Amino acid sequence: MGKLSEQLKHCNGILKELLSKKHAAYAWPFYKPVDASALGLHDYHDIIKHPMDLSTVKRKMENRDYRDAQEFAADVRLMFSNCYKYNPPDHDVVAMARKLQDVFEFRYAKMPD
Numbered sequence: 464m465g466k467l468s469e470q471l472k473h474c475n476g477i478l479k480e481l482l483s484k485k486h487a488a489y490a491w492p493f494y495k496p497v498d499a500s501a502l503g504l505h506d507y508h509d510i511i512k513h514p515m516d517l518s519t520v521k522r523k524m525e526n527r528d529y530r531d532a533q534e535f536a537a538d539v540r541l542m543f544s545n546c547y548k549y550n551p552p553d554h555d556v557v558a559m560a561r562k563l564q565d566v567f568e569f570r571y572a573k574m575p576d
């Protein structure tokens with residue numbers, strides 16, 4: 464019933480949408496941790512100090528790690544910030560990040576107060 468639980472269920476809804484087939488064409492680079500070794504990105508962990516991905520966010524939601532919506536948002540935005548910091552701004556992964564962030568920001572804005 465409480466405000467924090469209700470706001471966290473909004474976040475869970477967003478999370479579920481970000482991982483849905485509706486957004487899969489652009490969301491898929493954010494499903495799993497960046498495997499820097501597999502992708503040849505041997506400078507990734509020198510540039511990105513706090514890696515984040517939707518699977519980690521989902522793990523933290525399932526483990527009741529997130530105490531409020533603001534904590535959930537900070538992880539989702541960190542994932543996007545990491546993409547914008549590491550990747551050239553003309554790489555498809557950045558375009559895909561932009562589109563998924565647009566989904567995140569517009570539904571997050573509708574959070575029950």
Ligand SMILES: CNC(=O)c1cc(C(=O)NC2CC2)cn(Cc2cccc3[nH]ccc23)c1=O
Nearest residue numbers: 492493497502504546549550551554555556559
């Ligand atoms: C969060 N993900 C990343 O930061 C990421 C970085 C790089 C990457 O190679 N970045 C280099 C600096 C350019 C490659 N991938 C895979 C990928 C994703 C999307 C389109 C693609 N087209 C070709 C590969 C590819 C990612 O998911």
